[PDB]
Design a protein around this ligand. Structure first.
Ligand SMILES: CCCCCCCCCCCCCCCCCC(=O)OC[C@H](CO[C@@H]1O[C@H](CO[C@H]2O[C@H](CO)[C@H](O)[C@H](O)[C@H]2O)[C@H](O)[C@H](O)[C@H]1O)OC(=O)CCCCCCCCCCCCCCCCC
Ligand SMILES: CCCCCCCCCCCCCCCCCC(=O)OC[C@H](CO[C@@H]1O[C@H](CO[C@H]2O[C@H](CO)[C@H](O)[C@H](O)[C@H]2O)[C@H](O)[C@H](O)[C@H]1O)OC(=O)CCCCCCCCCCCCCCCCC
Ligand code: CLA
Ligand code: CLA
Ligand code: CLA
Ligand code: CLA
Ligand code: CLA
Ligand code: HEC
Ligand SMILES: CC1=C(/C=C/C(C)=C/C=C/C(C)=C/C=C/C=C(C)/C=C/C=C(C)/C=C/C2=C(C)CCCC2(C)C)C(C)(C)CCC1
Ligand SMILES: CC1=CCCC(C)(C)C1/C=C/C(C)=C/C=C/C(C)=C/C=C/C=C(C)/C=C/C=C(C)/C=C/C1=C(C)CCCC1(C)C
Ligand SMILES: CC1=CCCC(C)(C)C1/C=C/C(C)=C/C=C/C(C)=C/C=C/C=C(C)/C=C/C=C(C)/C=C/C1=C(C)CCCC1(C)C
Ligand code: OEX
Ligand SMILES: [Cl-]
Ligand SMILES: [Cl-]
Ligand SMILES: [Fe+2]
Lengths: 33, 30, 244, 27, 97, 442, 37, 137, 334
């Protein structure tokens, strides 16, 4: 299908940036206790 | 590519389910 | 001793043509003087073959088998017409009326659906001269009409049609319409098909005959949207003859 | 003429209660 | 080269009179005496080469010939358009109210 | 321990007050049967089909062969009146017994008489009461056989000639047929027991059911439940009520589909046509109309490529085209004359349609069971004019609703009965909370 | 329509089918009387 | 606007004589049309043959003319096809066929007039809605 | 110690991380069959001739759909209410064209979902609970039965059951409105009241409890750490919440009894959703919404339109366009 090329990069980043943020904060939480 | 993207995300959600259930923080009393 | 509806319903036998005893090897003789009709002609296809598109120039594509997906919905039946004696003793059946079409869709290898209008509409079919008797070597050859699979009111998924519907791609208001003319402007095809009917059983007592048939015709072109495929249909027929 | 016989029916019910109370019965 | 044949036929007499060769049968209600009886006959005996051929329909009574003459000016004939006669569309073209 | 809004649960162990509740409520049922009939008769006009008149009980009586003649033409109204009166009168006797037993009779029975008293937990007394009622039910089913065979028969929409009251002389006893129904698929073209389509089978089944019920009634009076049954059920009044709520719910769903699909024991002459019937009747109608105009309905290709008037079902039977292709399992007496063994027969269609069939199809088409809640007939976009909702829509919708809530009531009471039987229906014991003595999950 | 000799009670009859409903209503007048005990 | 005598004034015959209904006749006719005719002719259409409607211009072109009280009362007694060539009492409600169409049994001669009057008045009030179908709902 | 009795012990064990139970014994296979067929069909099923007119609708991702437009398409109108298991098709290719997978999925799901409700009773009994959580789930379950089973039964075709997809859902609810005027049906109006009210009382209850949490924490920590799982003391002050809410309205429109309050929370959306499921279930037998079309006319008899007539104009445009090739005769009677 003739689909917006940037949709892919947009989706990947939309997923990746907020997810990595959350993981960073979780892992350094476990390294405390 | 859009098909792969859709199924990929869906696949991630199912995997998350697995960890959320079997690798949860186990509730502990008082 | 015939069957009833409630014995047949749901069996699939409603889509089968009547069969003749394998004893039935007689001959129905023809009085040049008297006139005759076919009170029932039944055509029951068994095989759908489709011509491939061979891409090159001198390989000529073959007929490949297909898978039927529209179920026991395929037979032509209750067909009737004049049966005339020509000057040189050939017979000529002229179709008048009957359930003389069925939409069919078969599937090629790879998934492609091929719809077609399996029909004998306006069939005229003749024998060789000097018949005088219909026998287990009598052959009919003829041609029929193949109208458009969809008739003129049919609306495509964007609402476009021939006798009704939009005349443009309304979801693309400032698109250049030249690329879309083939899809926008619907056309009613009308083509011919050929059929041979080979008589192999004959009940001389009752005027029932039966045998094999092969027809060749075109598939659906989606109102000119795309190019049709060539289709070859094999099956069995039964017919009954009456003094008119 | 749909009060010459209805109204009496709808009152029958509550009149039974107004008579059992006011005469204290096993309500 | 891609023409909508029905639209093209609206540019002919077909678009102004009852076309004895194409028009759906409900058109014969617009003039008196013609529906259902004569309309039934006109349709089954189409096609016609001239408007005047309707009167050579076998079995016409003299009263029926009078009605047709009374209405010949409301008829026309154009070429049969396959798209308008296939599907039994002259008896029922999918239009109701 | 119960509040006012659960106050009828105070009757669980008051067998005498609970008798009065049941018999007074039985009176309400008979009252409505009688009153509703007289209301319908007072409003009845014979020249109008019943189903133009919002009647649901006159049609049940007529179906038993009373008041009607050939065609369902109403011949004599007096049977209706009699049925209404006798029910209405009989409800005073039940009202009388109910208020007596609820208010003045002995609160509890088991001291006055050891025969009428019962403990819910007395499995033998309970199977005995069950048995008596089974016999009664068996008698009732036989009453219908008696009417059909010995007191005038029943209305037969399939009677040759348009329908008529016919005495049933050869009820079907062959258990391959009777029990055959119970094993047919509930799906389309099969229809489980909803597909019964002749009165021989109806009457024969009631013979079987009457005997089965009498037989089981005797069985249960004479036995006590075996141990596997003792260990699998809860034995309490609430538990038993839950069992019957479940059974009534299932029966309500069946009745819904019965009145929506079946045009034998709900003749369309009285109840109006079924949805499928009406839809078949429309294709019949325009086929007739168009063929009179000269159309060859057999060779006429519609827009889709499928026949405009006639096509094949998936097993090949010739059937009506258009959307009604879904309803080709429809069978009705106005239609069957046209069916041959391949389905609808093109030569009977061209040659043998009768005026009475034209009339019936126009009538049913224009009386399809479609209507608004305020009784405006037709499709939902239709204008006001026609005051009409089919008795079948009223009977189907009402009983779906009641069936649903009785299923909720079954779940409600079945859960409660289990928890009360185990001793925790009122909540968790703080000092012995089961979960706190169980190991953690993780 | 009813038989002629009962013509009289026509309008009482338009009302009879509704009486069962009244018993439910009546149950609530009784509990209002007794204080929803 | 109101139900004035001019609107209640409809042709009596083809001669051109005319008749003025009362409000009473009009509402009488509307009621009777709902009782006996609307199941198929709601709004002036014909659900079982949409090609023939109750518009005044259609009735006018019918053989014999039916745009008048006389033609309509006759039609209700002895209905014919639109060209007049055959009688269709067997499949259309009519006093001639009240045996098979029971609703016609108790219609009196004045009832017929009130019904025919309603049919001729309603197009004057509703316009193209009368006989026009869902497009004009 | 016997084999069957040890099996029974494991089936009903309160110690499995996920409870199985006897309802579980049917639920698990049927929901696995429905899930697995759904996922495969959604991704890769070929187009299905939903309306029986040899006009297949493409529903799956690989045939040019996205997450919003894709669906498992309902089975063919040519099949109606006939049972169409795989082994009744000449081939899988036929079963696919005619919409077999919808049937497989909805029958397995409705079974497994009925057993889901029963499993809720069961574990409630094994744990010494009160039993009626399952009664609350009967509301959603009844709703799924209505759109997948009841409405098809009444209209005579699974082709008219709700599609398994996002836009298919919208298609179903638009066509429903044209054919039943569901907006003007009182049972749908009670559904909206049950669902709007449910979200309202959700927000209310959550904001009231949250407003009255007792200070157990500092401004640098989540308040949620003020509650410890299994503590015996309640974690908010209900009298303070009653005192605020009763002054926001008046005293007697406010609940001081937590049991009545939570029972209210349960009953309002459950009963509203029962009624709306009953709406779909009775419109399945064409007892449609109120029809006030042309109900207001003037002294002469001109129609005076209301908002109901405007609704009708919109319903008309839905009616005449839907399934634009499937009707050959003037009335859409099912
Ligand atoms: C104890 C635990 C129970 C466990 C049981 C599990 C196995 C059974 C599952 C049943 C599934 C029901 C599918 C119904 C499909 C359908 O075609 O169902 C309708 C069938 C009737 O079938 C119709 O039956 C018809 C019979 O009429 C025929 O015969 C007639 C005779 O006059 C006429 O002639 C008519 O024209 C002619 O067609 C035809 O066969 C039709 O083609 C056919 O569709 O009904 C019938 O089987 C009647 C029974 C249907 C009950 C279904 C109601 C479901 C209610 C669910 C409630 C959910 C509540 C939610 C809870 C939360
Ligand atoms: C404050 C008061 C407290 C109210 C508390 C809330 C309770 C709700 C009750 C609504 C209150 C209004 C009811 C009275 C008005 C009404 O109804 O009035 C309606 C009629 C009285 O009106 C008459 O209603 C008739 C309805 O038509 C019926 O009669 C016609 C006669 O030509 C035709 O036969 C038509 O086909 C048939 O349907 C006609 O329109 C008459 O002209 C008109 O006078 O009363 C009836 O019928 C009465 C029937 C009552 C029994 C209802 C049982 C129905 C069970 C079906 C369950 C469906 C559930 C799904 C819901 C969706
Ligand atoms: C079918 C409906 C029905 C029936 C038959 C019953 C029957 C009964 N209820 Mg239940 N109840 C119902 C609905 C019903 N209830 C509803 C809807 C509610 C919710 C409000 C309740 C709430 C409720 C509570 C809270 C209690 C009962 C109790 C009782 C029992 C004792 C009542 C008593 O002494 O009243 C005394 C009442 C009177 C003296 C007033 C007059 C009542 C008469 C019978 C009215 C009938 C009039 C009629 C026209 C007369 C016809 C006469 C003619 C036929 C001869 C009785 C068996 C009580 C119980 O269990 O006791 C242990 C109890 O505490 N009920
Ligand atoms: C339970 C089965 C049942 C069924 C299928 C019907 C069906 C019918 N009745 Mg009967 N009726 C019943 C019970 C039933 N009624 C009862 C219990 C009574 C006593 C109140 C009556 C009293 C009655 C009268 C007095 C009349 C009818 C009439 C009618 C017709 C039109 C109904 C209408 O417009 O509804 C309107 C719809 C409603 C009021 C909807 C109610 C929604 C409720 C409140 C929700 C329920 C949820 C829970 C249960 C229809 C044929 C009328 C008719 O045509 O007579 C010939 C008529 O005049 N009925
Ligand atoms: C199923 C309902 C039912 C049940 C189980 C009972 C049970 C009882 N009643 Mg109650 N009663 C009922 C209905 C019921 N009654 C009704 C409907 C009425 C009004 C007529 C009464 C009026 C009544 C009174 C006035 C008294 C009782 C008493 C009693 C007790 C003694 C019975 C006895 O020895 O009678 C003797 C048995 C007979 C005379 C045999 C009766 C034969 C019957 C009438 C024929 C049955 C045929 C058939 C099943 C009925 C259907 C016909 C119909 C369809 C047309 C007993 C616990 C007494 C009691 O406990 O007082 C302390 C008492 O004083 N009852
Ligand atoms: C109101 C009707 C009724 C009721 C409530 C009971 C109640 C009871 N019966 Mg009795 N019974 C009845 C009628 C009834 N019976 C009749 C008429 C007969 C004569 C045929 C019998 C013959 C009978 C015998 C021979 C026995 C009982 C037994 C019992 C007890 C155990 C029941 C049980 O476990 O079933 C639960 C049923 C099962 C576990 C197996 C049923 C599986 C079927 C196939 C399910 C089908 C459901 C399906 C969805 C619907 C379609 C139906 C299908 C056939 C097409 C219980 C007290 C037993 C007992 O203890 O007797 C003392 C016993 O052995 N009953
Ligand atoms: C044979 C049928 C049957 C029987 C005998 C019982 C018997 C009982 N039920 Mg069960 N119940 C049933 C069906 C039945 N139920 C159904 C079908 C449901 C599903 C909704 C329930 C749900 C249910 C619940 C949730 C509860 C009971 C409870 C009870 C007990 C007390 C009930 C009471 O006093 O209510 C008194 C009556 C009222 C409070 C009035 C109810 C009024 C209804 C809701 C209004 C209907 C209005 C009508 C349709 C339209 C109005 C028209 C207008 C003109 C008036 C009693 C043991 C209670 C219990 O567990 O006790 C152990 C209880 O908590 N029942
Ligand atoms: C269906 C069951 C109908 C009912 C009830 C009524 N009419 Fe009818 N009508 C119907 C049809 C199928 C036809 C066409 C008949 C034909 O083949 O020509 C008609 C026609 C009429 C006409 C003629 C209209 C015209 O254009 O000339 C009239 C005037 C008419 N019908 C009136 C009428 C009346 C007054 C009715 C109630 C008493 C009535 N019809 C009922 C179908 C049906
Ligand atoms: C058949 C008949 C008869 C009988 C009848 C009867 C049986 C009656 C009954 C009656 C009844 C039985 C009545 C009742 C009534 C009731 C009512 C009328 C009620 C009301 C109510 C109300 C109104 C309520 C209110 C309230 C309350 C109280 C509380 C809470 C709130 C409320 C609001 C709910 C007679 C004799 C006539 C004779 C003839 C015929
Ligand atoms: C028990 C109880 C306690 C708590 C409260 C609650 C009210 C719920 C409660 C329940 C009460 C119940 C349900 C009461 C039951 C009473 C019943 C069913 C009463 C029935 C009364 C019937 C009677 C008279 C009928 C009278 C009949 C007559 C003349 C007939 C006359 C007629 C004849 C003969 C010819 C036709 C015309 C006409 C006039 C109709
Ligand atoms: C009378 C009639 C008229 C028209 C024609 C027709 C020939 C059809 C005809 C005949 C009809 C006949 C003979 C009907 C027969 C009906 C029969 C036999 C009904 C069958 C009922 C059986 C049912 C529900 C069984 C339900 C079983 C359940 C709960 C089991 C539950 C349980 C299970 C499964 C495990 C253990 C715990 C527990 C709770 C016991
Ligand atoms: O399919 Mn689905 O949608 Ca219930 O209506 Mn008829 O069908 Mn079709 O149309 Mn409208
Ligand atoms: Cl659509
Ligand atoms: Cl259609
Ligand atoms: Fe809370």
């Amino acid at each position: 299908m003739e689909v917006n090329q940037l949709g892919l990069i947009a989706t990947a980043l939309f997923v990746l940036v907020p997810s990595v943020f959350l993981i960073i904060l979780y892992v350094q939480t476990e390294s405390q206790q | 590519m859009e098909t792969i993207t859709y199924v990929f995300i869906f696949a991630c959600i199912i995997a998350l389910f697995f960890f959320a259930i079997f690798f949860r923080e186990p509730p502990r009393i008082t | 001793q015939t069957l009833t509806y409630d014995d047949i319903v749901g069996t699939g036998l409603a889509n089968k043509c009547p069969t003749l005893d394998d004893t039935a090897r007689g001959a129905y003789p023809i009085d040049s003087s008297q006139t005759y009709r076919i009170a029932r002609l039944c055509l029951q296809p068994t095989t759908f073959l489709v011509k491939e598109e061979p891409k090159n120039k001198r390989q000529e594509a073959e007929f490949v088998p297909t898978k039927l997906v529209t179920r026991e919905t395929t037979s032509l039946d209750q067909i009737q017409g004049e049966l005339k004696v020509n000057s040189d003793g050939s017979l000529t059946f002229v179709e008048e009326d009957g359930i003389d079409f069925q939409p069919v869709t078969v599937q090629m290898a790879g998934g492609e659906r091929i719809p077609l209008l399996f029909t004998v509409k306006n069939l005229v079919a003749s024998t060789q001269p000097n018949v005088t008797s219909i026998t287990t070597s009598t052959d009919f050859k003829g041609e029929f009409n193949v109208p458009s699979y969809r008739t003129a009111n049919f609306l495509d998924p964007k609402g476009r049609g021939l006798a009704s519907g939009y005349d443009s791609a309304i979801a693309l208001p400032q698109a250049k319409e030249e690329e879309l003319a083939r899809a926008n402007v619907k056309r009613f095809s009308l083509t011919k098909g050929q059929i041979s009917l080979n008589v192999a059983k004959v009940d001389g007592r009752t005027g029932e005959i039966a045998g094999t048939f092969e027809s060749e015709q075109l598939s659906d072109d989606d109102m000119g949207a795309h190019e049709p495929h060539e289709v070859k249909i094999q099956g069995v027929f039964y017919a009954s003859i009456e003094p008119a | 003429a749909q009060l010459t016989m209805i109204a009496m029916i709808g009152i029958a019910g509550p009149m039974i209660i107004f008579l059992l109370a006011v005469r204290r019965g096993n309500l | 080269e891609l023409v909508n044949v029905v639209d093209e036929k609206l540019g002919t007499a077909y678009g102004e009179k009852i076309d004895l060769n194409n028009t759906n049968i409900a058109a014969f209600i617009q003039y008196r005496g013609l529906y259902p009886t004569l309309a039934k006959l006109i349709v089954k005996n189409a096609p016609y080469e001239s408007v005047e051929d309707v009167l050579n329909i076998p079995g016409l009574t003299e009263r029926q010939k009078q009605i047709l003459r009374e209405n010949l000016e409301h008829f026309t004939v154009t070429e049969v358009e396959t798209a308008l006669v296939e599907g039994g569309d002259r008896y029922n073209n999918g239009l109701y109210k | 321990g119960f509040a006012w809004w659960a106050g009828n649960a105070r009757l669980i162990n008051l067998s005498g007050k609970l008798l009065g509740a049941h018999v007074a409520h039985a009176g309400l049922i008979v009252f409505w049967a009688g009153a509703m009939t007289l209301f319908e008769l007072a409003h009845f006009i014979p020249e109008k089909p019943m189903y133009e008149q919002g009647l649901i009980l006159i049609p049940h009586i007529a179906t038993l062969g009373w008041g009607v003649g050939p065609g369902g033409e109403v011949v004599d109204t007096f049977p209706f009146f009699v049925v209404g009166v006798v029910h209405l009168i009989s409800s005073a006797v039940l009202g009388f017994g109910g208020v007596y037993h609820a208010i003045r009779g002995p609160e509890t029975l088991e001291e006055y008489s050891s025969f009428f008293g019962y403990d819910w937990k007395d499995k033998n007394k309970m199977t005995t009461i069950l048995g008596f009622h089974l016999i009664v039910l068996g008698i009732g089913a036989l009453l219908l056989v008696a009417k059909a065979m010995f007191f005038g028969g029943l209305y037969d929409t399939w009677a040759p000639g348009g329908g008529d009251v016919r005495v049933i002389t050869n009820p079907t006893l062959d258990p391959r047929v009777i029990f055959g129904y119970l094993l047919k698929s509930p799906f389309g073209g099969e229809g489980w027991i909803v597909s019964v389509n002749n009165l021989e089978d109806v009457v024969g089944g009631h013979i079987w059911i009457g005997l089965i019920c009498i037989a089981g009634g005797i069985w249960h009076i004479l036995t006590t439940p075996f141990g596997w049954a003792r260990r699998a059920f809860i034995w309490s009044g609430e538990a038993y009520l839950s069992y019957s709520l479940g059974a009534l719910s299932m029966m309500g769903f069946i009745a819904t589909c019965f009145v929506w699909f079946n045009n034998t024991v709900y003749p369309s002459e009285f109840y109006g046509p079924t949805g499928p019937e009406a839809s078949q009747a429309q294709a019949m109608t325009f086929l007739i109309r168009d063929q009179k105009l000269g159309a060859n309905v057999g060779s006429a290709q519609g827009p889709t490529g499928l026949g405009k008037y006639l096509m094949r079902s998936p097993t090949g039977e010739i059937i009506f085209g258009g959307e009604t292709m879904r309803f080709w399992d429809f069978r009705g007496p106005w239609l069957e004359p046209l069916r041959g063994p391949n389905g609808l027969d093109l030569n009977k269609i061209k040659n043998d349609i009768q005026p009475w069939q034209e009339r019936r199809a126009a009538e049913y088409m224009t009386h399809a069971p479609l209507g608004s809640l305020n009784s405006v007939g037709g499709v939902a976009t239709e204008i006001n004019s026609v005051n009409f909702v089919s008795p079948r829509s009223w009977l189907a919708t009402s009983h779906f609703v009641l069936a649903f809530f009785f299923l909720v009531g079954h779940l409600w009471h079945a859960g409660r009965a289990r928890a009360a039987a185990a001793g925790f229906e009122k909540g968790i014991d703080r000092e012995s909370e089961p979960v706190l003595s169980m190991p953690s999950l993780d | 329509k009813l038989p002629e000799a009962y013509a009289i009670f026509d309008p009482l009859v338009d009302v009879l089918p509704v009486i069962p409903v009244l018993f439910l209503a009546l149950a609530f007048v009784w509990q209002a009387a007794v204080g929803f005990r | 606007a109101e139900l004035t005598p001019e609107v209640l004034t409809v042709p009596l015959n083809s001669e051109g004589k005319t008749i003025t209904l009362t409000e009473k006749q009009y509402l009488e006719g509307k009621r009777l049309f709902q009782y006996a005719c609307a199941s198929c002719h709601v709004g002036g259409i014909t659900k079982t043959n949409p090609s023939l409607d109750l518009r005044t211009e259609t009735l006018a072109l019918a053989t014999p003319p039916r745009d008048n009280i006389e033609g309509l009362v006759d039609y209700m007694k002895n209905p014919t096809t639109y060209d007049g060539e055959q009688e269709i009492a067997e499949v259309h409600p009519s006093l001639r066929s009240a045996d098979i169409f029971p609703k016609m049994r108790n219609l009196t001669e004045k009832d017929l007039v009130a019904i025919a009057g309603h049919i001729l008045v309603e197009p004057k009030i509703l316009g193209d809605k009368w006989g026009g179908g869902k497009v004009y709902y | 110690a016997n084999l069957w009795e040890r099996f029974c012990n494991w089936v009903t064990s309160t110690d499995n991380r996920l409870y199985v139970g006897w309802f579980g014994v049917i639920m698990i296979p049927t929901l696995l069959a429905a899930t697995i067929c759904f996922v495969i069909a959604f991704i890769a099923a070929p187009p299905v001739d939903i309306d029986g007119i040899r006009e297949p609708v493409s529903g799956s991702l690989l045939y040019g759909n996205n997450i919003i437009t894709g669906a498992v398409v309902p089975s063919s109108n040519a099949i109606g209410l006939h049972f169409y298991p795989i082994w009744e098709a000449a081939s899988l290719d036929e079963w696919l064209y005619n919409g077999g997978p919808y049937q497989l999925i909805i029958f397995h799901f409705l079974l497994g979902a009925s057993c889901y409700m029963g499993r809720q009773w069961e574990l409630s009994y094994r744990l010494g609970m009160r039993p009626w959580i399952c009664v609350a789930y009967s509301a959603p379950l009844a709703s799924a039965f209505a759109v997948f089973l009841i409405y098809p039964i009444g209209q005579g075709s699974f082709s008219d059951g709700m599609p398994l997809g996002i836009s298919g859902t919208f298609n179903f609810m638009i066509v429903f409105q044209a054919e039943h005027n569901i907006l003007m049906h009182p049972f749908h109006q009670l559904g909206v009241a049950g669902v709007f009210g449910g979200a309202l009382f959700c927000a209310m209850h959550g904001s009231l409890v949250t407003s009255s949490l007792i200070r157990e924490t500092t401004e640098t920590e989540s308040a949620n750490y003020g509650y410890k799982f299994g503590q015996e003391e309640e974690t908010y002050n209900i009298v303070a919440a009653h005192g605020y809410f009763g002054r926001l309205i008046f005293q007697y429109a406010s609940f001081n009894n937590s049991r009545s309050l939570h029972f209210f929370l349960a009953a309002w959306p459950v009963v509203g959703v029962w009624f709306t499921a009953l709406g779909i279930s009775t419109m399945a037998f064409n007892l449609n919404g109120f029809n006030f079309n042309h109900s207001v006319i003037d002294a002469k008899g001109n129609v005076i339109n209301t908002w109901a007539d405007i609704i009708n104009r919109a319903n008309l445009g839905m009616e005449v366009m839907h399934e634009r090739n499937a009707h050959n005769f003037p009335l859409d009677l099912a």
